[PDB]
DNA sequence: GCTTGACAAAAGTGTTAAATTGTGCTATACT
């Protein structure tokens, strides 16, 4: 019985790097327009942890779901832009 | 010698072996051949001894036949066991993880006494594991050995213990059967307060018979005079309530109780050993229970002779349980027989009951027979039993001594903890039977031992030793094998006593052993038998220590143990100074290839060797090549013969792992210097020439086995694949299509061997993780990565791959689709930290290895390979290691006489034909007749040159070494020579461990120990004591909180080191929280109170 | 000699059909090769032998600018089925350099790295004799080489 | 049994002690062991020769010089501070315990001398036949 | 806290035992032979001892940390860390 | 004697009723886990079969009570119920112990606490620890008394989180993830970094068995080639260290206090005399005697 | 003990113990032995209460016996007891449980309703507290450090 | 800079069939 690993045990190096990843995102997001960053956070549920539908994010900014879908595509090609993405690469897994 | 291809190794023995060493694997093969009773055993017991040989299988089958219920209306009879040809070959089984077995068949006859009908049916008992030529079994693919157990033979044994209080004498007799309750004098079934007289009447004998039979016994009359039992049936009642308390008896039950307990054959088991022991010494007979009490009364009285009332006279004396006459030794065949007997009796239960509820005339031998419990006994015996062990093979010698081991532990014997030191001590009767010098150093000492060289096992389980009988001061060629009982009968002449012409006593008086055994000096007049040769008492490994007679038993034991600890080298050089056994121990081990017919070699390949016999027949032998052994050593074999070569039956065609030219080579011959050197070789440490690295003289290979399977999971099927969810294409660079490492690849710690994947869900990815997915566009994959990687701290080249697929027909346990095994191998150069040793018990780690440039080096410019510290030698009584260091130099440089004109005085006793040997010739000094001190000196001067005629060593075995560091000579002459040193299975690569963070235990959060788990070190009770004595509270707290059990604190501390912040304050150890919970579960209310507020909650 | 490549074998621990020596016991033999090279830069030698016989260093065909100084040396013994095709790489250096693993170098799965001994010299000793008062010292050194 | 015994204070101040034999009856000759008994201790009371001059004051460490000095004056016994007589409420006191065998000086106030005693006693036990 | 003063013991009364308990385990059942999930009311039951996964009820209707400390009206499992599965006790009421 | 028990119940508020159980607590599931090993086969604590007998018998008792049943049957159930709760708490303490397959007795709740393998000695008074290693030891003759040879591979793993930080400080690695891979693959840059972090950072060395506190001492680590541990020859006496192949454990003190205790209290050169006889220990011996003699 | 009195038993036991170790060539300073012997004499048998609060035949600590026996406005005798029996008498119930006879200890503790103050060092080890010895003593662990104003000036 | 409508995938939701699971029962006589 004492040879069994605990698979749900917290690994220190990951929780720390996850803390560090949570830092780098907060920074990269600061390079986006207030609404651009705000839409990404709600879309993926960064702050709350609860993701939101395009219609729901359109409800906070007062637009259609399609408008949000558009703003989403743009900020993502902005995020995909190498100057923003270069730093997050090593967090692949 | 006497072996066809035997290499030429000159002996100093002054005697002649009258008897070749017996086949020393015999103890295993004979026991098994008896169990299966093949014609090879038939002829043996027919051509001598009893005329009705009964195989072990038939023997246990006679006990079953017939099966008859209380009615006797039906009888199920068994007979005629039969085996088919072995399912698969040994090689095939080790590969396919099956067990080497022959199916067994039986004839089952069921008879109905009412209808008089007969039903004969052939029955399949199961696959019965067979024994290899080498004396082993293949159980689920692993080679295993069944060690023989030491036990107390059934019989009546008396012991005299002085009264703890009155100091008066008392016996105290015991009778131990094969099976059933045991009695002691009547204290029975562990029920005290029982007079021995009350039962003597329970049989129905009237008191006058007591006064008639008791006779001269005074306490025999006073016990019946004191006993208040009146009548034979009333005594059975005083016996009935003590034996069966709680049950009101019946005259039918009161009488049958005693009859059924012992006399009845079913409940009480007469042993052939017990039946033979007491029948001569005096199922169970009423006649026998009287002679018991009679023997006892005539012991405490002091008479040495008891003539039974109607019986024959025998000595009345105490018995010794440690005397081998009373101690067997249940061999492998019997250990199997007993486990079969159990399996049948469990089946007889289902056969008996089955008859009742089965519709009659619808019952057949099969319908009553269910074989589950019979095969289970066998399978459950080989696994989980302590007498069935994984064969110990790092070298042929280790394997050969594993068989031939006899241990007193196991089921049917005493536990390791209870037995006292009286059984561990060597008895005088161990001589020539069980080697006294060989046992474990751990707290198994004396419980495990190895059978002697000439020892042989009796059909009854008693060890016999060969002797040569002497008559009228003349030793005959008659060789008689005697047990311990018949050895106490006679006077055993010493092995070496001067021989006279055609042979007879020369020395005025003879060395002899008495029945004490107490040694004595008497003339040639009174002797009967003599020893077959020196080293009868010694075992195989013990007999392999040159100059054994010069080393204290302490260091000798260590020396034997460590020979079986060595590891096969790539080169495998044989010992320069040997003993007798090296030749015959390697062939009898089976790790060498021997030819069974005279003939000539047709082909020699690294892969196989074929020989064309004079018989016209054609024999071929496939060579084991880089085969991984049980513990990871290398079994590689090499052919020693060439195409044209003629060869003779029993010769050696190919060398095994540790052998060279037919003799055991457990190590290399090295040039040794015994000076202390600059504090490097100190306190048993050793220093080495870097030559031993560059030239791969101590190098050895090693092979690890890695295994992974793809099974069916509730969420899908596991798939071996090359696709891994998150990796660079670099890690996969060495994987083939299917995702298994390519043969010939190089693998580091953490490299992938077999890629595997298992389904996962529902995942619920973290938001921070799902954002990167959108950005870099890598779909979160459907499955987790569970893949086979190489353990931390390991490395090598990929040797071979074995794949078993369900898609392919193959075979596998339910749920397992695919199994792939990967074999990694590495060359291990001799490394600082590895453990080396000689045959004398001298051991040490390599502390340093120097450039061959700076080393003590002889006048030739010949560097020494090893520098051994002078200080360890003198106090350890191992000085034999200095002798062989001298002889080693002799054998390496050659020598001459000493003649002319005449032969010098020392050589007179006498080296024969030994007067000259060339350079590099190999020597043999059998243990108890070896070279002698005089003969060493005479040889020590001899012979030049290095090349130039100058001599490098004097008659003291010393030389002037030049320091390779400063270049100046060492002020004094130093001893140099050649010593035989072995590389041992403790290696630094395996023993170096380190951990920072890693897996934790499930129930306790502590790190889990062992290298497999990447584990941490145990800081124990005693370590905490030391910490407390220092007064380091913060160190002690740290080790016990944030370095093990503190689940939040251990991740914080990491967070602190990586950010270079201060290390935080520790929390509560999880183990303590667990303790509170475990006490609560006992209904113990445990509250943790503060100063107040009273109860604190752990959460 | 640094590394070696044998067509049939992908690694050190197998056999070759018809050859008496296993690949590892052959590498041991090739250790005793005493070669010499003008160098610089690595250069491959070549050895191919068929049919029965005994292979030796003489059977090694050196490239232009290298030579084998003990062709008498036994490598492997071959039989009717034995065929041995092996190339050897000779580099230049000094001392003893342990086999460089091809994971560290750029080599592929086929290359067998081997321990390399670059030591022209074999065995060396010396001695001195003074020049009585006025004594001086004269030393003799005994130098032997591998050829 | 001894693990909770630690030095809790500098001085309990008791005058109590035990009488060490410090040889005897000669010449007409140190006790075979004054090294494990008298040395390292601290004097409970002044050591006085006849009639006499008080050759060593109470509280002295009793090194090697002190035993030589005392021996000259002809003192065949000395009263010494011991943890047996120590009156400390908790633990024992430095003065009563005496010199630390490790430091060679008065024991430190943190020292846990029970564990050290336990180990000092048990360690050689392997050598006890 | 890591600093407590006293630590006390006593006989646990049936009432103490019942107060510790987060439920009475009524069945000698460990886990389902097919799904391998904890059987309700048995040993391991998530309703009493706790959730197998963090902030995940047995059925899953409430899967999110958004509402901790609410019980699923269907499966009756509480939404919180699976760590409580280590801290929580049951009881048996003897007949 | 009988008073000692009767008196004990007066002063405490404990109702003596507690010695009879109306209800039995049940231990949390993770302390009696059931988990599948690698390959899917399952393993669980003995506690669960023990709890199973109890609840099985209690439930049968309820059943017989409700039907109505002759006392012989009902009383038999209560006797069985009593024995099962015994086995649960302490198995074999009365009668033959409840056994599983192979006739090995099941581990009771009492079996957890008691013995060398129980909670106290196994998991409480000692335990396995992070930031530790071991290897075989070799002689240190060139070392200063306060130093030890540490295998560089061993040092690397021991200090892994330290160097990971350092090589992120120096720009060798851009993020912690890269730093971790850089150490695992042992890229050559790390070595120079290791010497930095290891400098003047002490470590504890222990050899079992630990007899006196001197069986643990702090030293100054020195990166050493090879997989063995270089031990100063003057500390053999205290550790009772044979070079016949003994091994020693290394422990890395972390907090400032722990490192202070190492340098001040446990440092090799500050512990010379035995703290029993006061005689010198690190004093020369063996070779060093005959050399000076 | 009964003849020569408590302080003389100590002298005897130290001499006796010290004789075995002297026989085998071992040097142990008497104080180490004295530390151990001191723990055997620490209790006294209570012959009469008389108004206590103590029970006859019970072994109570000498200091705890002296103070509560005063009771403002109960006789015993010095008691020798071996180290094993002595350590079981210790006031820490979880210290006694970890030592030996765990079940016996826990059952007597739960009936006496025992409260452990966690003063001893083994107790603090088990719970992860700082042992009350060496650097863990209050006077040392509460040390406050600041640089001298003279030092801050030099900066 | 954003919105509309057409639209298909995705996700729920209710409705039904299939499977899984629980329980009762078996009457030569048998203790
Ligand atoms: Mg040792
Ligand atoms: Zn004091
Ligand atoms: Zn739910």
Residue numbers in the entry:
A (entry chain F): 374 to 466
B (entry chain C): 21 to 205, 215 to 311, 323 to 1139
C (entry chain A): 51 to 181, 185 to 200
D (entry chain D): 879 to 906, 910 to 1010
E (entry chain D): 4 to 98
F (entry chain D): 294 to 586
G (entry chain D): 1123 to 1195, 1202 to 1283
The authors write:
Bacterial transcription initiation is controlled by promoter-specificity σ-factors, which associate with the core RNAP (α2ββ’ω subunits), generating the holoenzyme (holo; Gruber and Gross, 2003; Murakami and Darst, 2003). In contrast to Eco holo, which forms an essentially irreversible RPo on many promoters, the mycobacterial holo forms an unstable RPo with a half-life of a few minutes or less when compared with Eco holo on the same promoters. Two transcription factors, CarD and RbpA, both essential in mycobacteria but absent in Eco, potentiate the activity of the mycobacterial RNAP. RbpA forms a tight interaction with the σ2 domain (−10 element recognition domain) of Group 1 and Group 2 σ factors through its C-terminal σ-interacting domain, but how other RbpA structural elements interact with the transcription initiation complex (TIC) and activate transcription is unknown.
To provide a structural basis for understanding mycobacterial transcription initiation, we crystallized and determined the 2.76 Å-resolution structure of a 446 kDa Msm TIC containing RbpA, σA-holo, and an upstream fork junction promoter fragment. RbpA comprises four structural elements, the N-terminal tail (NTT), the core domain (CD), the basic linker (BL), and the SID. The RbpACD makes extensive contacts with the β’ Zinc-binding domain (β’ZBD) as well as with residues flanking the β’zipper, structural elements of the RNAP ‘clamp’ module near the N-terminus of β’ that are conserved among bacterial RNAPs. The RbpACD/β’ interface buries a surface area of 615 Å2. Together with the RbpASID/σA2 interface (954 Å2 buried surface area), RbpA forms a bipartite protein/protein interface with holo that buries a total surface area of 1569 Å2. What is evident from the structure is that the RbpA/RNAP interactions position the RbpABL (residues 70–79) to interact with the DNA phosphate backbone just upstream of the −10 element. In the Msm RbpA/TIC, absolutely conserved RbpA-R79 makes a close (2.2 Å) polar interaction with the negatively charged phosphate between the −13 and −14 positions of the non-template strand (nt-strand) DNA, explaining previous findings that RbpA-R79 was important for the ability of RbpA to increase the overall affinity of mycobacterial holo to promoter DNA and for normal RbpA function in vivo. In addition to the R79/-13 nt-strand DNA phosphate interaction, RbpA-K74 and K76 are also positioned to make long-range electrostatic interactions (5.4 and 5.5 Å, respectively) with the t-strand DNA phosphates between the −18/–19 and −17/–18 positions, respectively. Thus, RbpA enhances an intricate network of interactions between the ZBD, the zipper, σA2, σA3, σA4, and promoter DNA.
